[PDB]
Amino acid sequence: SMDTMKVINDPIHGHIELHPLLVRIIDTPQFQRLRYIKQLGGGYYVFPGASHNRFEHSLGVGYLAGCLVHALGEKQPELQISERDVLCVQIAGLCHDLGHGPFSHMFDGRFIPLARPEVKWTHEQGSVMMFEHLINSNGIKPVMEQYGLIPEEDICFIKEQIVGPLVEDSLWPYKGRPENKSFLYEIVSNKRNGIDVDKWDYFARDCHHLGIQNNFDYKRFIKFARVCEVDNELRICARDKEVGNLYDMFHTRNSLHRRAYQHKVGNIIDTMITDAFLKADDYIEITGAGGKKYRISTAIDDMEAYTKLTDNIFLEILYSTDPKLKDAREILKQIEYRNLFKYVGETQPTGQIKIKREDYESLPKEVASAKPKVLLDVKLKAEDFIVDVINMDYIDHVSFYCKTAPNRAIRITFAEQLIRVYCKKVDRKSLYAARQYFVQWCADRNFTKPQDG
Amino acid sequence: TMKVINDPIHGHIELHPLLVRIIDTPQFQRLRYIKQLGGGYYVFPGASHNRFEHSLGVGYLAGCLVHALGEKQPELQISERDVLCVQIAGLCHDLGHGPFSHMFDGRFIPLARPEVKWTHEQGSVMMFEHLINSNGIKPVMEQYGLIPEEDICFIKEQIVGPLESPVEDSLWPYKGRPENKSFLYEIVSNKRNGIDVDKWDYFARDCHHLGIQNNFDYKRFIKFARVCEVDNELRICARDKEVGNLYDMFHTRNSLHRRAYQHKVGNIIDTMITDAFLKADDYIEITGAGGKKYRISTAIDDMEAYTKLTDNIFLEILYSTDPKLKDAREILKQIEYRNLFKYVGETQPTGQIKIKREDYESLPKEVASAKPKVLLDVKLKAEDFIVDVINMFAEQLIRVYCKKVDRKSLYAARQYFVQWCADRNFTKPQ
Amino acid sequence: MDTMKVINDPIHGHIELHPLLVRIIDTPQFQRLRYIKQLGGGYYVFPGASHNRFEHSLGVGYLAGCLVHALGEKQPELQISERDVLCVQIAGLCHDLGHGPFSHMFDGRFIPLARPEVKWTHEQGSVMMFEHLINSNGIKPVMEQYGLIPEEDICFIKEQIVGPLEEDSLWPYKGRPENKSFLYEIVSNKRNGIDVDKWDYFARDCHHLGIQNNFDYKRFIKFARVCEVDNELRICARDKEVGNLYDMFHTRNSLHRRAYQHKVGNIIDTMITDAFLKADDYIEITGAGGKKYRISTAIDDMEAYTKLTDNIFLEILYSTDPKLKDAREILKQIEYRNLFKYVGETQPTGQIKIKREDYESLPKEVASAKPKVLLDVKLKAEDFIVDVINMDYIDHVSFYCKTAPNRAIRITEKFAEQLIRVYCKKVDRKSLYAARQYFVQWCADRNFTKPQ
Amino acid sequence: SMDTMKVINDPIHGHIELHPLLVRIIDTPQFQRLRYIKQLGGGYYVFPGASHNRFEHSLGVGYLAGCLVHALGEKQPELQISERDVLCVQIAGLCHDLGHGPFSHMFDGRFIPLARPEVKWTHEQGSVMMFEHLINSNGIKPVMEQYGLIPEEDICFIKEQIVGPLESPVEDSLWPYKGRPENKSFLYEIVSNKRNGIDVDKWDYFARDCHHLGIQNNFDYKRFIKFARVCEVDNELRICARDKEVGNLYDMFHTRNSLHRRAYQHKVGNIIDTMITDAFLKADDYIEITGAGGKKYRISTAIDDMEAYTKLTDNIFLEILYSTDPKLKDAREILKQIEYRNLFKYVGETQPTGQIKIKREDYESLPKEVASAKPKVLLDVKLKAEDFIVDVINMAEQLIRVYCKKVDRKSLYAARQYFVQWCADRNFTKPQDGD
Ligand SMILES: Nc1nc2c(ncn2COCCNC(=O)CCCCNC(=O)c2cc3cc(Br)ccc3c(Br)c2O)c(=O)[nH]1
Ligand SMILES: Nc1nc2c(ncn2COCCNC(=O)CCCCNC(=O)c2cc3cc(Br)ccc3c(Br)c2O)c(=O)[nH]1
Ligand SMILES: Nc1nc2c(ncn2COCCNC(=O)CCCCNC(=O)c2cc3cc(Br)ccc3c(Br)c2O)c(=O)[nH]1
Ligand SMILES: Nc1nc2c(ncn2COCCNC(=O)CCCCNC(=O)c2cc3cc(Br)ccc3c(Br)c2O)c(=O)[nH]1
Ligand SMILES: [Fe+3]
Ligand SMILES: [Fe+3]
Ligand SMILES: [Fe+3]
Ligand SMILES: [Fe+3]
């Protein structure tokens, strides 16, 4: 007794039972912070239903993580899955997104690169740092001990699930659990086949809020799921008949990626918000540890300050009166009036090296420096250009099993990067010149000839 | 020109460009920062949705219904001008909502300024006028066939009703349209029978976000809806068998009202947010016309300040550093750790007694002033009490929470409460 | 009686029925289907397989309506009328009106063994039984009450059930013109295995057998359209919908592999047929003008065939006539679970497939096979059953990409097409061994696959 | 000699393992008989998916009886549940419905009371009779001994589970049963239970009738099994569960309700049942069923000889419908009416106020007294008893519906007049229909 599981009523998963340890981790300012970070960032300004935040999705990931590890233990007891392992996997699923910043992938994937090109920051490292901070700012280690967890090993295990291994030895890299349980590291985030409960939840939830049909049935997948040995390595395998379900999922994956995550106006609005943040970064102060004041771009260095870095920043800019924020405020005002940056074109580095984040800040200048062979009336500044780099995760690298051979696999034996360009000046002459500069840049970088007309 | 918005309930929503000019304004975009169900989100993780989505949906349904009635019955002389006016009324019916929606006008303003008569509908008319004038949309109305005089009046009357100044007589009160088009006033806001497209949309959307089943089919009602004469009066009526659909609606409505809108913990959290606001109202500054500083409780007096009053205030309190807001900040912190006010009991006023908003502030003190008819010991302060008034079309509930959580403090609270119910001749709590 | 009646089915919820369909259903000719088990003798293997042809027929008519109406609303260009909808619904209702006792057992084994000279199919029986239903009741005037033109519309319904009633490369059908060709693909379709008949009985046999079925027929109907292929209007699907189709074909395999081809199930079917054959001379079914028929000849008179039903089984089982003791005894073996014994399975792979007209000769050929080593026991034809199990069989289906809505996408399983099983009526070890020797030698003489 | 476990695939319970002894009992004519008796009687003619028969249900009850008795024996070794006891309970479960006649409850609940009012016949009595006939017509007693049972006391135990205390002594509270002592009293509660209404029979037919009717079922029977106990109350061992599982209990009672209103008390359904009974009655004089020693019996007396009763099943229905004998045309026409959907017409419903229950011995008299009721408002058509059907629907609680075989408007108005007055003469609830 002492404590009790609690029921949360979610529109995707229904009744969610939660072990009291998970509840103690949820009822913390560090976790509740996720109620104020919209899942799809600026997608909301394009899809009215995309009001949802990382908090809901995180609960869903935790629930799905628990369901799947429990099913594998029930079906295959030989794996030695313990209730402790279950709890650790649920905690990892709950906290995999603790580190996101205002407007989710906008922050670590565009803003920090443009604000601090020398820094290498990702939301996953942020999640591990935030998790540590949540453990220590509240009293979570003794509760872990109260429910059987070994904080040293299990904290390591949870963090390793979130960010990966600490290494070319080809020996077992992880230390939080041994290699005999390697498959548990494939539950919350899987890079091999991209089948994890994180994508299950955000595929379902983003379809629910976007009005997209989703025919993937994750409960049916969990039911017919099983661990099997493929290439002397224990992996999560799927029943041979379940391929149809997997088709339905990958089609959902494409429909979400093409219709939403790569929405032209959605991404333009993301970069407009990034422009405001940059034009506000020097004047916005966030109080962190020891009273020290951090900026939007440096909050990630102090978890106490980052705990208060949220979509709120947007309205903190929009509602301000300080003349120093006038620049930033005005950009957000254009978003409200729907006077957006205008789309110039799209290209891909097909065949070429991929653009790195450290070079994002240099791209506008390159574009403005491109010399069209037809000399132009209007001349444009690097400040007049936005260069948007869109990366994508990524038929079947999924391990299967035969209905009678559940121990071994069957043995069966789009793009990685887009580059769009937007212009801040909107007169037809300026936009014509933008296109000229842009085509010439794609030729200079040996990128694919844009074909927008 | 024609913009398409993809909504999860209605699918593709086309918007006449005039409606779009009205949407792309700070006064309307403001609704993106006011959660539909207020504090319900803190109980239902799926209730992340805001008045903005709902408003677009209401506008779409208003248009669908008036256009369908115009096609079936051309003799009504419904014009595209009328359609646009009804759509604008649907779009803007909730412009006047405040932080956390019904929390603001139904508890906060009453407790902060008991003398004031403020409702979100009046607020909607004020915001609507302010939206009209701060952007240049009157000439756009003229550009798309509307007559701003008559039509502005018609829209505001759809939102708030007639300018209450009659001779309380049985004559025709509205001024924006004639009585021969009386049915147009029944689309966005009703109250005669409590069927309007506002309810259609927020029933469907709140069910979609709460995980509740909804088999009311608003599209089929529109199909079988027509105008007919009831007591020499034009009203929107439905074919007889559509009764089956409407039953499905009231069961949906009841299912929403008990399961979500009257949730024990949700409403406790609602009063905790209200308590934070009250304890912050003196120190939070909101700038309005001419730089003048308003408080949370006085933004409703200046629409330029009110345009910036939203759920943001919650985080402005939570993230603050002013020691004077520590009181308020701490309450919001208490919500995060889930250390909520405690539920003491529930009662109702008998007969047709209804507690008015102007009296809400006195209720805690009455409880603290009640002497348990059986003399005891522990004595509690009125500040230690919260009294929540929950409304339902005609009926009214009264719950009581205690801010102190000591096993003894709550035992004593339950007594102040039973005695209070006795003193005011209310129903004996269970 | 004019009103839309509502029926509750476990597969499909509320089934609304146009009064014309109800007048067709409330006839003895249609109610006959309540007394013919869907999976025949499979009930004696699957205790949940109590269902009959009646529930299934209601379902097929319902799905016909669902689909044809969806297409007509999504593509008004097709000129689909409510008359068209009804014709397709009636065809769906009556597509199985011709089945006999124990469904495919009767036309697929019994009639070929009892009357090899005859060519009888349950579809021919459906068209016959339908004509009889129309005329024995007042159906034609009711059709006129609801817009049908009985002349050509009856032709259209029959053509949906049996195929081109009766040769060049032109449009063989006469009930509808070629611009309506897609209507002939709803109830029965051959090119691919996508029709509402198979939809309903896939879902219903799974429901009664305990098999999981993941095919969502409502999804398919919602995303179906009419597209051009080669130069033929035909039913097409979304590219997106391929995942659903996988599940459907998987259901097909699971039904065929563990129900329709169940070993003991088919054994019991042949036992029932053996009884019927041993009873055909002595069982009387009264038909038109009071003439008397037998099980094997009731198909020649729809008035008698109306009364030819699974009931035959119990009329035999409960009989006292000594002339029928032979037949009765076989059925009692079924009740005692003393069944014919399985000997082996083979396939005519690479050979011409066995035709029905030859079924009667198969026992005897097996008994005439000369094993290399001679056995103690000698076995007679009557001691052998030769079960020929035919089936209709990756993507022979047409799709449309979202933006190419009237053009196929251009695509420029592990199941035989005939099985041959042999059982022995003698059940002692020595005779069963003998049977195996006879069976393999027959397989060698016929150059059939070498048995297990 | 030594055999094997036999696996059957059921849609409700899945893979069902059956001890070879149970299979020896199942592979008999007396048991296979149940494949030809529909579970819901005439409800199939209203619910097209209700094609299921007593056979699959019987298998299900035998299976669940085994599951539960085994769970109790495993968690509570103190109760001394033996594998012999398990088998006895499984056989009771299998054979609890061996006695049903054509169309299940239609036969013993209406047909027999109308055709032989003096006789007291219930399907449970029939089950015990058919079970004895099954044992002796086949070689079951030696097989029973082959697998450990003591036929003498164990056959008694199985019968006692099916019908109850096989006798009626003058001993108050003392143990009436003789197949097992009082320290195993709870075994008599698994298959059949009347003290609170929870037994594996109702588990199976609740879930199966929901499956085939399209009704939703919220009861999880194996969570009950997992959380079931035997405990002492009033110095009496009883099957009890865990308080947290109460949520499951309520879920089942809603199913009990949802099934009883929507299916077991369907208006058109019960009407069709009375029409079938009317056919049987108008045919009872002319249909022959051969029984023991070659004697010939009728539908109404086949219950007097288990050998003929083995051959009395829903087939009767079609034997009438397919007949040519003119003596049977009267019955045949009624069944043909069913096929054309020209059914008896509903007049009204009432209940016997207070704790009154019409007894079966009186069913035959009910149409007749109805016809003599003097409707105060003198009317046109005079209706006779034969024109009236009085359906007694039991489930305490009893409904009395009345139907008229004449269908013209005038006769139906007259019929309602007779019916309202009858309710008054009997002091029954005022027919609150007012159609
Ligand atoms: N207005 C409004 N729409 C809203 C809202 N919320 C969801 N949506 C629905 O839209 C989502 C995106 N598509 C739009 O059409 C809206 C953005 C328009 C931005 N401004 C322009 O000038 C413009 C730019 C384009 C760029 C491209 Br590449 C292609 C067509 C374009 C067209 Br068309 C334009 O008009 C809301 O709050 N307001
Ligand atoms: N800790 C935390 N919880 C959070 C947060 N956000 C949402 N929730 C969920 O809790 C709010 C209450 N849940 C509901 O109302 C569900 C709606 C349906 C009706 N259910 C109940 O009436 C109800 C049932 C219970 C059963 C058990 Br067993 C234990 C406690 C129960 C409570 Br409490 C109940 O209210 C968050 O941030 N933190
Ligand atoms: N008993 C029953 N089973 C039923 C019912 N309804 C569905 N099922 C289940 O259907 C599956 C078929 N069951 C059979 O018993 C088929 C018996 C005919 C022979 N074929 C065999 O495969 C078989 C061969 C054996 C050879 C030897 Br040496 C020893 C034991 C054997 C056993 Br055991 C066998 O099964 C129902 O009413 N009664
Ligand atoms: N012509 C002809 N008709 C035939 C034949 N065989 C069958 N039928 C069909 O008619 C049978 C008589 N039906 C009626 O009189 C009307 C039934 C009234 C409903 N009763 C229910 O219990 C019931 C209630 C529900 C409530 C809700 Br909320 C949701 C779902 C429900 C469902 Br689903 C229900 O089932 C045949 O051979 N011929
Ligand atoms: Fe995630
Ligand atoms: Fe509203
Ligand atoms: Fe069929
Ligand atoms: Fe039973």
Structure description:
The structure is a homotetramer. The first copy, chain A, is built from 17 helices and 10 strands. In chain A, the strands form 4 sheets. In chain A, strands 3-4-9 form a 3-stranded mixed sheet. The first copy, chain A, is mainly alpha-helical. In chain A, 43% of the residues lie in helices and 10% in strands. In chain A, strand 1 (6-10) and strand 2 (14-18) form a beta hairpin. Chain A has helices spanning 20-26, 29-32, 54-75, 83-95, 105-115, 123-137, 140-146, 151-163, 197-210, 218-223, 243-261, 264-280, 303-306, 312-318, 326-337, 363-369, 428-444, and strands at residues 6-10, 14-18, 225-229, 234-239, 286-287, 293-294, 342-347, 385-391, 400-401, 417-423. Chain A is globular and about 75 Å long. Chain A has a domain at 342-445: Alpha-Beta Plaits (2-Layer Sandwich), CATH 3.30.70. Chains in contact: A-B, A-C, C-D. At the C-D interface, helix 3, helix 9, helix 14 and helix 15 of C face strand 1, helix 3, helix 9, strand 5 and helix 14 of D. The complex binds the ligand Nc1nc2c(ncn2COCCNC(=O)CCCCNC(=O)c2cc3cc(Br)ccc3c(Br)c2O)c(=O)[nH]1 (4 copies) and fe (iii) ion (4 copies). Residues 54, 58, 93-94, 198, 202 of chain B line the site of one fe (iii) ion (FE).
* Main interface by residue count: C-D, 43 and 42 residues
Separation of the first and last Cα atoms of chain A: 68 Å
The fraction of residues in strands of chain A falls at 5-15%
Overall 3D geometry of chain A?
A: globular
- The tally of strands of chain A reads 10
The run of helices and strands of chain A is: EEHHHHHHHHHHEEHHEEHHHEHEEEH
Largest sheet data of chain A: 3 strands, mixed
Radius of gyration of chain A: 24 Å
Q: Assign the CATH class of the domain at 342-445 in chain A.
A: Alpha Beta
- Discrete helix count of chain A: 17
- The percent range for helix content of chain A is 40-55%
CATH architecture classification name of the domain at 342-445 in chain A: 2-Layer Sandwich
Query: CATH topology of the domain at 342-445 in chain A, what is it called?
Result: Alpha-Beta Plaits
Tell me the structural class of chain A: mainly alpha
Strand order across the largest sheet of chain A = 3-4-9
Oligomer: homotetramer
